[PDB]
Amino acid sequence: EDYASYIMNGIIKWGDPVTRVLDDGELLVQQTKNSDRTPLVSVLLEGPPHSGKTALAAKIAEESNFPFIKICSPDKMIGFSETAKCQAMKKIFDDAYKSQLSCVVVDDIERLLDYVPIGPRFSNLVLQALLVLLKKAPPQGRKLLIIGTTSRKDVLQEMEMLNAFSTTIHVPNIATGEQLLEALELLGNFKDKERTTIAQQVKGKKVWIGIKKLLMLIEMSLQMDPEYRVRKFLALLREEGASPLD
Amino acid sequence: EDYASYIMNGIIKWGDPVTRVLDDGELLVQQTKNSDRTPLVSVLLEGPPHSGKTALAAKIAEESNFPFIKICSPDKMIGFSETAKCQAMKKIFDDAYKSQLSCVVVDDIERLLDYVPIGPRFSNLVLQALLVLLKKAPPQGRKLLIIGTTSRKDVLQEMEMLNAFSTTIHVPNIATGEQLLEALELLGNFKDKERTTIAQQVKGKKVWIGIKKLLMLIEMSLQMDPEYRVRKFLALLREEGASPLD
Amino acid sequence: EDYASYIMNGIIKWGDPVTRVLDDGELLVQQTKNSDRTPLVSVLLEGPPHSGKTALAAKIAEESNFPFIKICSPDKMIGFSETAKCQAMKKIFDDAYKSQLSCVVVDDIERLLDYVPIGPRFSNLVLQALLVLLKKAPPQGRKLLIIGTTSRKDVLQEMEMLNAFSTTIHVPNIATGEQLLEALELLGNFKDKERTTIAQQVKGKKVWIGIKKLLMLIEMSLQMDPEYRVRKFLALLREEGASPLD
Amino acid sequence: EDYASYIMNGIIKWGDPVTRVLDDGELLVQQTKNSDRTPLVSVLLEGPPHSGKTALAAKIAEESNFPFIKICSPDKMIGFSETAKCQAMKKIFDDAYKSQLSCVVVDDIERLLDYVPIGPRFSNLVLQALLVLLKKAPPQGRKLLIIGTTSRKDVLQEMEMLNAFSTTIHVPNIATGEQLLEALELLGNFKDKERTTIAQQVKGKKVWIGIKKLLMLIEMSLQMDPEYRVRKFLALLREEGASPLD
Amino acid sequence: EDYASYIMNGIIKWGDPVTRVLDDGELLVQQTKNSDRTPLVSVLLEGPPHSGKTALAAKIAEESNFPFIKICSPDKMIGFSETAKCQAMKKIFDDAYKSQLSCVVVDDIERLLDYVPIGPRFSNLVLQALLVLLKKAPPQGRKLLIIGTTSRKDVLQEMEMLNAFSTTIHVPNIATGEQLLEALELLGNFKDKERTTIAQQVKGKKVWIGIKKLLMLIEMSLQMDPEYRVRKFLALLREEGASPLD
Amino acid sequence: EDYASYIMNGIIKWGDPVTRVLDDGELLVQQTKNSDRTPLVSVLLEGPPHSGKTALAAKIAEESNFPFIKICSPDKMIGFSETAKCQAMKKIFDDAYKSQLSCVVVDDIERLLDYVPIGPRFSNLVLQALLVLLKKAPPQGRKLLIIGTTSRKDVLQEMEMLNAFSTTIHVPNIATGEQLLEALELLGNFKDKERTTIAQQVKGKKVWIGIKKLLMLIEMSLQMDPEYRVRKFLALLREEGASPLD
Numbered sequence A, B, C, D, E, F: 001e002d003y004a005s006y007i008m009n010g011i012i013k014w015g016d017p018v019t020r021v022l023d024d025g026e027l028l029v030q031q032t033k034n035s036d037r038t039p040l041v042s043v044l045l046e047g048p049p050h051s052g053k054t055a056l057a058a059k060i061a062e063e064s065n066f067p068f069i070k071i072c073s074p075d076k077m078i079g080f081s082e083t084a085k086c087q088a089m090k091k092i093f094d095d096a097y098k099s100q101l102s103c104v105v106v107d108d109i110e111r112l113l114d115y116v117p118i119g120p121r122f123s124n125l126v127l128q129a130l131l132v133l134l135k136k137a138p139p140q141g142r143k144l145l146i147i148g149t150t151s152r153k154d155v156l157q158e159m160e161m162l163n164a165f166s167t168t169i170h171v172p173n174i175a176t177g178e179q180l181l182e183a184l185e186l187l188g189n190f191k192d193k194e195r196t197t198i199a200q201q202v203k204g205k206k207v208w209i210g211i212k213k214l215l216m217l218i219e220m221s222l223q224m225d226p227e228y229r230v231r232k233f234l235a236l237l238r239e240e241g242a243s244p245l246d
């Protein structure tokens, strides 16, 4: 499995939440590996869009060192009918069942389910397939850890899937001026002086931006002349904030 | 039929409800076997998710000692169209009809019917097949006991299926501190001292957790260091409770 | 045609309604046989679930002594598409049209129409086929009596089918303590003493239970020890009553 | 074309409405035959169920003496898909277009359109086919009179079809005690004395029963002993009345 | 192209609106022919049912003298699936694109789109095809004038098609007693004396009848005896009026 | 790729917004070309209908000088099923992925998605394909800039697509009398004197017309006699304004 594809810009420790996600992930891996009572363990990584769910799921899977690791993604099922998706999924789980210790990542569940809020509309046959697969224990003695990711926990709850996962792990956006500065420093993009200015403008204030989104705002800001990079970054950050009124 | 698959962690007598379910199940088995008036008997085991419905249904079926016993599960029908499911079901009942005394378990009815609350949506052709099969007597002189399971009695009622079953048996979650401790003791997971602490924290208080869910919380708690296992268990139990406001 | 299959436990005269149903049925048979003005006569037997509609329809058909008698049932059309059901129905009526005097029973119309209250949903193509067949006179000079059965008169009315039948015959549940005792006596299940006790508990009081449902409650009660059979029967009857508030 | 099939019990002159329907029908036939301006004329016979629409349409068509006369009925299209019905209809009109003077009866439009009030549901492809055919003039110089029938004028109006017909002719139920007695006398069913009694009970009072329905009530009443025939007829008439409150 | 088929009863100048429609049509033809900036021009002729939209569209197209003129009509697509209609349309436009100067009439858009107000229902694939075709310029240097007709401008607006047309031309019903008399005179149907009477009854009063509908009322009135023709005409006109309350 | 087809009447600098759109477009092109962090950049050009979105998107793409440039348009997918559209799209992106630096324009998204406000209705399979493609990075090291266009930003937001684009660029209609005059002058259509008159009538006043729509109004006005061209233009502009009440 190619993780570089799912962890294109590493896993930077911008804040304690990152460590929490990884540590809780390892606990589930350990449980899956050593428990006879629960040979099947499932966890849903959920949070706001762009918070870093897919990369963290891939990282947890990578760190498991399991003999079988497979990531189920919407990427190679574009245009697939409900039945075709179900068959592709059954194939992945069937292969996993042949391993003594396996990890399957079901990435971007709302996309796998062809979900759209207007209606709403979605592929029920695929939803039903997942509900069954999430509860199906591998052959006696074999173990499986299923890691799902979503930016729509609310929808999955309404679909009664949230109750199918053993547990869920929240993957929050960067939420404080300090976490933001930590991310910038670890990413090493602005000049020492520019970060001091940014810190002056954000420290103490609340922020709400996903790590993936932060990468984009940084690159956009860097296209500006040196004198305007910080101004541009702060303006973009101002537009990518959380609605005070919702 | 492989029951070990459906009764992976035994049938522990955590409380009187367990005995009630099994005893009422045996009465229905006896009626099916000895009655000429009602050669067809059906019962719906229903309760909250994870309360132990499938395992108990499998146990009732196993204890019947009937020459023909078959469990109809969503597991091998993932991605199946409505028609395909109906044919798979007709096959099972047709085989049952060839036996003088048979028991068919129709497990996880909401999943067999591809039910989802959003809409709602479901496979009506499959619902109709079940409504007919639940009322169809085997060839004259032959007997059949149908045992269905569901975590959604309300939905089946609205579908007018609840009225198709001869009777229903409630499979409750563990509901008292005493039943909880009994389960823990029978499962033998915590140290004698740890259970005393748990008893101190739960005795007298109300609880509402399904046996299957309890197994998961236990295993999660055991991944903690010895000094933190009880704290973790109680915290998880606190999150898996019933909403006081609904 | 096998009536034993549709009249598994006879036709007991538990009350005057039974005689009324049969007498009105014979009048329609006579009209169909002797009228030149109305060579096509249709009647809908309707009532609460389990009231005995199918058995009575089969009995009316049997007593007609017509050269052609066929019962159209959902039993052999499980999983059938709308088109497949329509073709199966057309076949039955086409065969009937070849006879000078025929009777076709269209049993469990809500099931033939794949009806479910959620939505609601149903097979309109099948509904339309029935609406046409109910009004189609056999070849000139030939006669046909169509007997339909349903537990959902309200739904058929809304579908404008009720207006397609020549008339309807109500098949009520047992409604008085006296009719209940008459049924028990004719079925001869309890000891002379046990019926006196039951009579003491129900006489004068209102009841509302279908004959088919009564058979089931009796058999369930008989699985109890002799000393507890009556207590069990009365408890079950108490649960199978009509809602005072609806 | 077999009219005997569509006019099984003649066309009795029970009241002035019958003459009106036939006279207006002949005027349309005359217009279709002699007009160069309107080579295509369409008329919708509409009224309550059982009022005699189909028989009158067939009679108007028969009296036209047109070289081409065809009745399009739901009878031979049971189970037909929308496309199949459209093709069957196109065939009839295509044949009509080959005649210099033709009459096509489109009978029971609500049934041809697979209409049901629940939803509602209907075959839009068939509706669209009719909307186009109702407005399509035959080849230059050729003439066509289209006669449709329905018991649901309201629905056709909502479908914007009512506006596609050149005009409509109301086919009312028998509405007065005098028209009722006239029908009975012309049908010659009761004894001279029995009609005097009926007249005594209905004269001056309002009635609302379709001629086809009247035929059925008469036959049902005749199955009674001589002394009870009138009582039965009046009781049935009492149940087949119009709701004072709707 | 056969215009006689679409202009069966000529184009009479009953009022100024007729001249306006034709003059505005010619301006669009001229623009299409001489403009390099707008090689693609589209216009929607819209008005009440029977106002004469199709005939006027055909007339505008005929007067263009364009080397390629094609009328797309629902007439030869009865029973066609959405895909089949789209292909038929693509064929017409593809042929038009091969001409240096073309005119395509898309007649009765609501019928091409299988529109019905109940639901509503319509063929979205066909709507989408039209939305694209209405905005697609012919190969560089080639010109195309698209003329659509509809009696449902409101619906097309809601479908966002009205915004796809370059402009729209209103085709009103005859709206004044004077325009009505002008039409009658040009059609030359009543006796000189009869028109004086009609004028006496309508002059000064408002009217609202489509030219096509007027043709029908005239022919119906002519089927009456000479003494009753005017009375009949006025009575029919009275029924074909506009609702004062809507 | 043929841009002349998508930029039929050039890109005139009628106002500062035009320069803004092009400059922001170039910044995104530069970012796509030089960034390692964001190899995938997407931008949605959105604005009122006819504001010039497609031409500007094509211009931004043309100015990128990328080795691979492809415009995905609804034009060659008329009548295509959802699956067929998805396959056509996958083909374009797959080809783009083979290039080191590519630009794909996804034009008229509401049309690609078969969107209609009534219902609403749309092709969810196509929407899902776009949601995945908008987030899929090209093979490691390769770069892709996706430029979408729409006149319905609101709808895309509700579909959660707006959140899939890296950013959006507003393409406004001409909004001031000065911008209008600048457009007219650059297009060089009216006589020096006529523009002075127009300026007199619009200067200081607000306007809201898309450049593409302006081209049409100009051509329509030019079909008038010299003395009436300005009057016609102003009248048309008066009808193509923004609703003060919405």
Ligand SMILES: Nc1ncnc2c1ncn2[C@@H]1O[C@H](COP(=O)(O)OP(=O)(O)NP(=O)(O)O)[C@@H](O)[C@H]1O
Pocket (backbone or CB within 6 Å): A006, A007, A008, A009, A010, A011, A012, A013, A014, A018, A048, A049, A050, A051, A052, A053, A054, A055, A056, A108, A149, A151, A210, A211, A212, A215, F135
């Ligand atoms: N601590 C971190 N956690 C997660 N991703 C990180 C972290 N540090 C850097 N990244 C990078 O940030 C990006 C996160 O993208 P991704 O994992 O696709 O987000 P996502 O929340 O799954 N997106 P979406 O599914 O679009 O909401 C990847 O390029 C990661 O390599």
Ligand SMILES: Nc1ncnc2c1ncn2[C@@H]1O[C@H](COP(=O)(O)OP(=O)(O)NP(=O)(O)O)[C@@H](O)[C@H]1O
Pocket (backbone or CB within 6 Å): A135, B006, B007, B008, B009, B010, B011, B012, B013, B014, B018, B048, B049, B050, B051, B052, B053, B054, B055, B056, B108, B149, B151, B210, B211, B212, B215
């Ligand atoms: N008394 C008991 N009753 C039922 N299951 C028990 C009992 N004691 C232990 N178990 C175990 O608990 C688990 C119950 O799981 P299961 O029977 O699948 O629950 P369920 O309620 O059918 N689940 P779901 O269908 O997901 O709501 C099995 O592993 C059983 O072996």
Ligand SMILES: Nc1ncnc2c1ncn2[C@@H]1O[C@H](COP(=O)(O)OP(=O)(O)NP(=O)(O)O)[C@@H](O)[C@H]1O
Pocket (backbone or CB within 6 Å): B135, C006, C007, C008, C009, C010, C011, C012, C013, C014, C018, C048, C049, C050, C051, C052, C053, C054, C055, C056, C108, C149, C151, C210, C211, C212, C215
């Ligand atoms: N008087 C009676 N009328 C009808 N059935 C009777 C009577 N006496 C005994 N029975 C028996 O009671 C049973 C009635 O079952 P059935 O005719 O299937 O009921 P139903 O109302 O058609 N059921 P459902 O369609 O499930 O509502 C049969 O076994 C009959 O033989």
Ligand SMILES: Nc1ncnc2c1ncn2[C@@H]1O[C@H](COP(=O)(O)OP(=O)(O)NP(=O)(O)O)[C@@H](O)[C@H]1O
Pocket (backbone or CB within 6 Å): C135, D006, D007, D008, D009, D010, D011, D012, D013, D014, D018, D048, D049, D050, D051, D052, D053, D054, D055, D056, D108, D149, D151, D210, D211, D212, D215
């Ligand atoms: N004056 C009459 N008008 C019409 N039918 C008549 C008349 N006199 C006798 N009849 C008979 O009455 C019956 C009318 O049935 P039919 O024409 O099918 O009614 P309908 O209104 O079309 N029925 P439906 O379509 O079920 O509402 C036929 O048998 C006719 O022969």
Ligand SMILES: Nc1ncnc2c1ncn2[C@@H]1O[C@H](COP(=O)(O)OP(=O)(O)NP(=O)(O)O)[C@@H](O)[C@H]1O
Pocket (backbone or CB within 6 Å): D135, E006, E007, E008, E009, E010, E011, E012, E013, E014, E018, E048, E049, E050, E051, E052, E053, E054, E055, E056, E108, E149, E151, E210, E211, E212, E215
């Ligand atoms: N000035 C006129 N304008 C239009 N049609 C005219 C005129 N004078 C006479 N006619 C005739 O009136 C008829 C109009 O019919 P048509 O053009 O089909 O109307 P329409 O409004 O398109 N109908 P519909 O689509 O059913 O609303 C044709 O027979 C024309 O020849």
Ligand SMILES: Nc1ncnc2c1ncn2[C@@H]1O[C@H](COP(=O)(O)OP(=O)(O)NP(=O)(O)O)[C@@H](O)[C@H]1O
Pocket (backbone or CB within 6 Å): E135, F006, F007, F008, F009, F010, F011, F012, F013, F014, F018, F048, F049, F050, F051, F052, F053, F054, F055, F056, F108, F149, F151, F210, F211, F212, F215
């Ligand atoms: N500054 C400009 N920006 C955009 N288009 C321009 C400009 N100047 C001239 N044009 C021309 O104006 C027309 C714009 O049409 P187009 O780009 O299709 O608009 P659109 O907003 O994409 N249309 P739609 O998709 O129908 O809302 C083209 O012919 C352009 O060549």
Ligand SMILES: [Mg+2]
Pocket (backbone or CB within 6 Å): A053, A054, A055, A108, A149
């Ligand atoms: Mg992700």
Ligand SMILES: [Mg+2]
Pocket (backbone or CB within 6 Å): B053, B054, B055, B108, B149
């Ligand atoms: Mg279960």
Ligand SMILES: [Mg+2]
Pocket (backbone or CB within 6 Å): C053, C054, C055, C108, C149
């Ligand atoms: Mg029945």
Ligand SMILES: [Mg+2]
Pocket (backbone or CB within 6 Å): D053, D054, D055, D108, D149
């Ligand atoms: Mg009829």
Ligand SMILES: [Mg+2]
Pocket (backbone or CB within 6 Å): E053, E054, E055, E108, E149
């Ligand atoms: Mg027209």
Ligand SMILES: [Mg+2]
Pocket (backbone or CB within 6 Å): F053, F054, F055, F108, F149
């Ligand atoms: Mg565009």
